[PDB]
Design a binder for this molecule. Structure first.
Ligand SMILES: Cc1cc2nc3c(=O)[nH]c(=O)nc-3n(C[C@H](O)[C@H](O)[C@H](O)COP(=O)(O)OP(=O)(O)OC[C@H]3O[C@@H](n4cnc5c(N)ncnc54)[C@H](O)[C@@H]3O)c2cc1C
Ligand SMILES: [Zn+2]
Length: 261
């Protein structure tokens, strides 16, 4: 059964140790430091809030945590954003985060200049969500949700079937993934269209025959793009949490979208 487990909250200050520019618009960052003690991540969509410096003020507000709650979400000067735990290696003591590099916000702009020695406040994960096994996983993701989708794919048993549709800017943004045998992974290219302005994921889903066996559909990406995907799944009688999950990670014209509500 679908199960939530909470983690204890603590304010961590971590430092960039490795930077890997894996594709032109994505940078993979390993964060470390003694604060990483006690950090946990059990599932593919686990995410932290990263707390960034202000590039203009030089100000850098970090999380304040007291009695298992963050106290300063509404303090002035804070810049926090949700990012996926791409990988967590407890023995290496390193937290890996994949950042989309874009110019529209401070998280994207920080990623563009990320280098060893940069530090970030790291809050969470608040907890983790376990799912029962499925026979066939259908995954849809634009670049903000690709880290979680890729983590999922690489953690699947070799027996699993996968059908994945990943929307990226162009062919140079494709990644080589360690997927189960026979996985079907399709890279969809915006080819000049701006992020969040196409219906490429919906169109791919519409062309996909519902597979055999126990199926789970997971979609993440731009909130408005996901609305017709949610509707399509529900109209075929599928139930949120059991048959699918659809999670808006960002939304055009909105800064720091809260995906909880
Ligand atoms: C659970 C969760 C997990 C996430 N994991 C990741 C992750 O692993 N990697 C990752 O890159 N993102 C991830 N995101 C998305 C990320 O939180 C947003 O993209 C966030 O808005 C980026 O912060 P920002 O400061 O760059 O710009 P913001 O200040 O939040 O937004 C400024 C403007 O830029 C736009 N914008 C925001 N993101 C993008 C984008 N990627 N491309 C184009 N325009 C954008 C906004 O619509 C807004 O107009 C995740 C979201 C959630 C909810
Ligand atoms: Zn969350």
């Amino acid at each position: 059964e679908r199960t939530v487990e909470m983690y204890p909250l603590k304010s961590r200050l971590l430092e960039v140790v490795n930077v890997r520019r894996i594709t032109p618009r994505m940078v993979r960052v390993d964060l470390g430091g003694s604060d990483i003690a006690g950090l946990r991540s059990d599932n593919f969509a686990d995410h932290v809030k990263l707390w960034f410096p202000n590039p203009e003020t030089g100000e850098h507000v970090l999380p304040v945590v007291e009695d298992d709650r963050c106290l300063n979400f509404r303090a002035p000067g804070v810049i926090y954003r949700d990012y996926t735990v791409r990988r967590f290696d407890a023995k290496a003591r390193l937290l890996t985060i994949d950042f989309v590099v874009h110019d529209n916000g401070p998280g994207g702009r920080w990623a563009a200049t990320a280098q060893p020695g940069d530090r970030l406040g790291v809050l969470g994960p608040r907890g983790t969500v376990y799912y029962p096994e499925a026979d066939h996983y259908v995954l849809l993701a634009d670049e903000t949700a690709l880290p979680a989708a890729a983590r999922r794919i690489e953690e699947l048993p070799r027996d699993a079937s996968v059908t994945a549709f990943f929307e990226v800017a162009d062919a140079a943004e494709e990644q080589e993934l360690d997927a189960p045998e026979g996985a079907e992974i399709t890279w969809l290219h915006r080819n000049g269209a701006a992020p969040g302005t196409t219906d490429l994921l919906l169109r791919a889903l519409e062309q996909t025959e519902f597979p055999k066996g126990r199926v789970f559909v997971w979609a993440g990406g731009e909130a408005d793009a996901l609305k017709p995907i949610r509707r399509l799944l529900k109209e075929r009688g599928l139930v949120r949490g059991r048959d699918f999950e659809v999670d808006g990670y960002w939304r055009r014209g909105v800064s720091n979208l809260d995906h909880h509500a």
